[PDB]
Structure formats: C-alpha cells, structure tokens
C-alpha cells in the first residue's frame, strides 16, 4: 500500500491496495527424475509402511 | 566372547622377565583401563585419589 | 499385441446375423453369402461406414475351418501351496528365521534373465503353532507383494483354513493381525495375477514365479524348510482382452498400416469389439492357385469373432449359417 | 556338523555356541531351546 | 504465549450478563448489543476503567461463529503401563539385568532434537517374583527420576496392585521397599507431569516420552523384557492456564503493548481471567469491505470467554442472548 | 564363568580345568569335587 518494509520504500506511485500493508510473494518450480528404480534396493521396517 | 579367543601374543598376561632363579622366568598380571563400545564410543579411565 | 501370420490374417466381427445383403443395417453384422453352386464363399459385414466384403474363399481350396470356444483362450492363474514340510519339522522351531523367497522370471522384460526376487520372513517363537505361523507369514508376504507402492501387481496371496478347505480369505498390506482370527490355517497359496493392459500398445503377459525356501537349522543340519506344490487353478483371465488386441492388429490389413503414427493426422479406424465381453473365434484357412504351371499356393486365413454367452448361441448360429450356405462341415462347438 | 568348541559352567545362560554345565545337568542349544542330556 | 492472528484478535471476558447498559456496574460484565433490523452487533463490556464497547460486527460479513465447550481445551496426561509380557517370560529370569530406558524428548529445548534419558535397573534373583520386581523397579525408577530438589519431576511413577486394580500406589524417592507391602503388583504406570506456568512468560508445555527397554536373553536370544502400552488418561490439566495466556496477548491488541519492559514505568493492565477456573470460549470471525474502490477485506475476530461450572450454563446464557439480539445461529453446547 | 575347553578320557581323574569321561560317566570339577552329570 503506502510503505514497503521489504525494501524500505516510503511512498507509492502504483498502489496495490489501501490498507497499508505489504505481502511478499515467491514462486519456484522443482523436479526430480529417477531413470531406473530397480537399481535402488531398500529394507524398510514394517512399522514404516502404513 | 566365545567368538574370539584371547591368546598370549596379543594380551601378554604373562611376560618373560630376567631373573637369577630361572632362564625362562615368567611374570603374570593384566588390567583393563578402556572399553570401546560400538559406533565410536570409547571410555577411558582416570583415577583421582580425591574420590 | 503383434501376432504371426500365414501370409495374411483378416478379422470380421459377427455381432449379428442378418441372412441376406438387404438387412445389413447396424454395425457389426455378418452375412455368409454363397452361390447355389457352392464354389466361392465370402462374408458381407457391415462396417461402421458402409457395407464391406471379405475375400472370395475357394471352397475346394480350404485347408481347415475350426472354431474354438471362449474357454480355450483363458489363461489359468497358477497357484502354489506353501506349507510346513513335516519331515523337517511339523511345528515352527523356537529360534530360526523362516524366510521364503519368490523368484519371478519375466520382470519388465520378455526374457527369463530379467528376474525379480521378493521375500517374506517370520522369526518363529516358542509356543507358535502351525496356524499362527501362517497368520504372520501371509501378512509379511502381503506387505511386500501387495502394497500400494509396487508398479506392477506381482502375486495375489490367499489363506485357506482347515474348516472351509476351499474358501480363500484375501490378505493385503492393510490386513491387520486381528482380521485373521482362525486357529486352523493349513496352507498359504500364492497365485499369479493378470497384468495391466492397453489396447494395441501393451500386450497381455504374465510374470511367472517360483516360491523358493531358505534353509533353517534343525539339529545340527540346515534342512531346507518347506515344500511348495502346484494346485489346480481356479481363477482364469477373461477372453476379451486377447480379442480386442486381435482385431486392432487385423484391421491394419484392410485399412491403414499405421494406427496413430504422427498425430495431427490419423485415419481413425473405429473398432467393434468390447474388451469386457468374451468371444468365440472361427478361422477359415485357405489358399489360392491358378490353373497353370504355377502350382505354388498362397495361404490365407479369415478370423470371425462372435460374442459368447456361455452356451455359445451366437457362434453355433454363425456356424450353422455358414454350413448350409457354403456346404462346409465346420464342427459346431 | 555343528561344532561346539568350549564348555562354560555358569548359573546363567552362557552362550548359544557353548555347553551350559550346571550342577547335575548338561544343557546345550537345540531347536531354539536348551536340551538336557540324560 | 504468542499466537498467530488474522490481522487482529480481540478478547473480552464475560463474568455476568446484565440485560442492558446502566446495569453494567462491576468489572467483567457484558451485554451483546444490536439494532432492531439486525444490521450490526457489538459487545458493551465493563472494563475496570469504564464501559468499553467492542468493534461493530457487520452481520452480512461474518465468516463463522463457533463456541468451545472448555473440555476440548484440556490436555490429557498420557499414561504408559510397564508389564513383563507373557511372550518372553512372565517371571524375571534369575540372571538377567533388567534396564528400562525412558526416552524423553523436548527437554528444556524447543525441538525433538533435545532428548533426555532417565533409567531404572533391577538385576533379578533366583526366588524373584514378578510382583516384587515391579516393586523394586519402581523404587529404582524413583531414584534416577524424582530426585530433583529444585523442581517438580519429569514423570510420576505409580504402582497398581491386582487386589485394588483401580487405585495407584504412589512411588517417590522417599519410598523404600518396606513401605510397599502388597504382594500383587502387576504393572508400573509412568504418568506425565504438568510443567510450570507463569502468566505471559512461559507457556504451558509438556515433555513427551516413550518407555523403552534393553534386551535380556532368555532362550539364548536377546528379547525385549517388557511392553509399554498406553492406557487411557485419568488425570487432565484444566483450562485456566491457556485462557489466561490468551487474555495476556489479546489485551495487547487493544491496550498496552509494553507488558512490563521498562519496569518502573509501565502501565499496569489489570487482567480479568483468573487461572484458577476453567473457561469456555466463543469466537466470532468477521471482516470489513469498503465502498467502490476498497473491496479488500480487513478480517477481524472477537473472542468471548466465560467461566464453566461443568454444565456449560454461563456460556449458554451468552449464546442465548446473541442469537436473540443479533439473529445468528450459534450452536448452543 | 569357569571356562572348560578340553575333555579327557582317563581311568584316573584329570586336572580341574578339563572334563572327565570314563566308561559312560561324565564328571567335571564343581564344588571342590568331581560331580557326576546325569
Ligand atoms: Mg528401487
């Protein structure tokens, strides 16, 4: 709105709302590939299955 | 530890000494001052005569 | 799937019998047409976009015409009874680890060298009876083989009590020890499972296995613990998946050889078979030869597919129409 | 075929791979429990 | 404690619901006020410095309105029962060292990575009965634990005899073997202990734990000697310590923020909620939407607290007066 | 705790650190004497 505590900018040419607050927004995109899952063996205890 | 037999070449609980009484004259004695638990836990003795 | 051919194989769906060419109204029809002098036979089938015919079967040049039921095209899911070999020990011994290995033989691939080994294991305690062992082992095998994580269904595992002796109780990864409350368990049966299937892209196959036992020490000797014997199978896979994949291949002979290759632009062949209905298969196999020095023949075959209801009403009516119209002695199944 | 090299006299359960000699009993490990001779 | 808010949280204390204004004379009274067309709603509450009227709730702009019966805010102290299971041995094995490792967590820390361990050890004898083992283990538990001269201990150790089966004998560090004269002890109970609480500086926290066992050998194999099963709790913590911390924070959303920082020069804000009684809660969460450019909502909430006499009478009189004046339908508990 | 390692077959008694076997009788050194097992 009026001030921006994330940068320190008192005054606003382009206001987003009028309630004198500031919301940060972040986005990201991630991803993990496993080519072959028969090349990883595993022994898990049976109380971890569910 | 039935698995591992504790011999004389590594423990040395009796040792050859030099004396006038016999050529192959032998000592006797041993003591443990350390235990080494699994996953890196080593305990060492420190004897304070204050105790 | 992809099949092998004797120089051609073409399929026509016999969803109905209309007995003359004028009654070809709805899709899936068939009319076995032949002349009054029985020398050529052909089938007028109703395509989804018009009337089409078959090749003119020379009735003096047929080699065999044998129709099979739906129960000759069902793969029986094989079973294996896991029991305690009483020559070793009728009771579970008080100390040993009782591990059972399941040796699959065609995992992912088509070879016998692409194996897969899953395990189920019970630490046997003092006072454990024979039935308490089967209660703990069919749970420990189900949490390995019938979990919600495995990409393919490996085996279906059942338990048989001594009071029923035929009725199977299903165990899964969610089966708790209070669900199985019976002190008369005498075997653990490990049955094959049907694989997931996509029309024309993923064929129908199975993963065969062998329950192999690990060794336990009775006395001072390591006595292979258990015995695993084959039981006569009870559950059979349906026929409709093998016949849905059989038309998809045989429509490419009379049609476009590629099916979806390059997709902005395909000629969509509309099929007429249901993968959830059982069918019957009739195969008139023949050849062609001309009256000259070319005595070499060109073998062919024609598959007909009609729906099966258990009493074979549509196929025997299809056989009975071909036999009187063409003069061929096809065996009514 | 199952070798036991040593024997241990004890009032407790000594070890799986040894002979438990009490006063008038000779127990050894067999089939998950201590089988007495005689 | 500090809480998370939806841009504000305002708390008002309901001690006695008078009928209207000029009847509010003592500190802590309240009356919900509204108009004849049921447009706005506000609570005129008597602060100890005068009448303080709350924020006006626009009745078209209410998200939810729900109340809490004050038994949904009481913490239950978990009880574990330590018994020798009949699977391993119902009697203590004469040569084995029985060590019980209590695995505590969150100790004088805020995370579960701050773990603490207390113990209890009894080496059994030849004529060792099971009931004398539960007598001797609990005293050895009361020596490693229950020795804090400074503060109250982490857990409470009890003993239940089988002749009583419902009344627990308390075991403390002063308790010797001769004080426990029963011969039928069958379990040890490890109850949680209510941690210290001061108003506005330390919250109501707890130290969770899990009684764990070290392996004894019975038939040459290392087995866990006991089982720790959780039974239903019998002793609960009342609601006095959570609600007084809630008034400590939501009186700083209206009044003084500097709650005892510059210590001679503070504003002494009197608190109305006493920690020696249980308290119901009623929440009203609303918003405000402006005209023609400011459509964004500034969401708010109003919390009301009233003393609970067990029968939920003082809260039901408060909900019964809001539903008449404002017209909302809050569930009377 | 006294660990016996050897078994000796002799008509007379061997040392206290071995087990005595003769004609069908097992004896080992317990309570200062040779005690029969059976
Ligand atoms: Mg893997």
Coordinates of N, CA, C and O in Angstrom, one line a residue, chain F residues 1-6 8 12-13 15-17 19 21 23-25 27 31-32 34-37:
Chain F
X1 N 31.3 -69.1 35.0 CA 32.4 -68.3 34.3 C 33.6 -69.1 34.1 O 34.4 -68.8 33.2
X2 N 33.8 -70.2 34.8 CA 35.0 -71.0 34.7 C 34.8 -71.8 33.4 O 33.9 -72.7 33.2
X3 N 35.7 -71.5 32.4 CA 35.6 -72.0 31.0 C 36.3 -73.3 30.8 O 37.6 -73.2 30.8
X4 N 35.6 -74.4 30.7 CA 36.3 -75.7 30.4 C 36.4 -75.8 28.9 O 35.5 -75.5 28.1
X5 N 37.6 -76.2 28.4 CA 37.9 -76.3 27.0 C 38.1 -77.7 26.5 O 37.9 -78.0 25.3
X6 N 38.6 -78.6 27.3 CA 39.1 -79.9 26.9 C 38.3 -81.0 27.6 O 37.9 -80.8 28.8
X8 N 38.9 -85.1 28.6 CA 40.0 -86.1 28.7 C 39.4 -87.4 29.1 O 38.6 -87.5 30.1
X12 N 41.9 -92.4 35.7 CA 42.0 -91.6 36.9 C 41.6 -90.2 36.5 O 41.3 -89.9 35.4
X13 N 41.5 -89.3 37.6 CA 40.9 -88.0 37.4 C 42.0 -87.1 36.7 O 43.1 -87.0 37.2
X15 N 43.1 -82.9 35.5 CA 43.1 -81.6 36.2 C 41.7 -81.0 36.3 O 40.7 -81.5 35.7
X16 N 41.6 -80.0 37.1 CA 40.3 -79.3 37.4 C 39.8 -78.5 36.3 O 38.7 -78.0 36.3
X17 N 40.6 -78.2 35.2 CA 40.3 -77.4 34.1 C 39.9 -78.2 32.9 O 40.0 -77.7 31.7
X19 N 37.1 -81.8 31.5 CA 36.0 -82.6 31.8 C 36.5 -84.1 31.8 O 37.3 -84.5 30.9
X21 N 35.8 -88.1 31.4 CA 35.0 -89.1 30.8 C 35.6 -90.4 31.0 O 36.7 -90.7 30.7
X23 N 34.1 -94.6 30.9 CA 33.2 -95.8 30.8 C 31.7 -95.5 30.7 O 30.8 -96.3 30.8
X24 N 31.3 -94.2 30.5 CA 29.9 -93.8 30.4 C 29.6 -92.8 31.4 O 28.4 -92.5 31.6
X25 N 30.6 -92.3 32.2 CA 30.3 -91.3 33.2 C 31.0 -90.0 32.9 O 32.2 -90.0 32.6
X27 N 32.2 -86.4 34.4 CA 32.4 -85.7 35.6 C 33.2 -84.4 35.3 O 34.1 -84.4 34.5
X31 N 32.2 -77.5 43.0 CA 32.1 -77.5 44.5 C 33.3 -78.2 45.1 O 33.2 -78.9 46.1
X32 N 34.5 -78.1 44.5 CA 35.7 -78.7 45.0 C 35.8 -80.2 44.8 O 36.9 -80.7 45.1
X34 N 34.6 -83.9 42.2 CA 34.2 -84.3 40.8 C 32.7 -84.7 40.9 O 32.4 -85.7 41.5
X35 N 31.9 -84.0 40.1 CA 30.4 -84.2 40.2 C 29.9 -84.8 39.0 O 30.2 -84.4 37.9
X36 N 29.0 -85.8 39.2 CA 28.5 -86.7 38.1 C 27.4 -85.9 37.4 O 26.5 -85.3 38.0
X37 N 27.3 -86.1 36.1 CA 26.3 -85.4 35.2 C 25.3 -86.5 34.8 O 25.8 -87.5 34.1

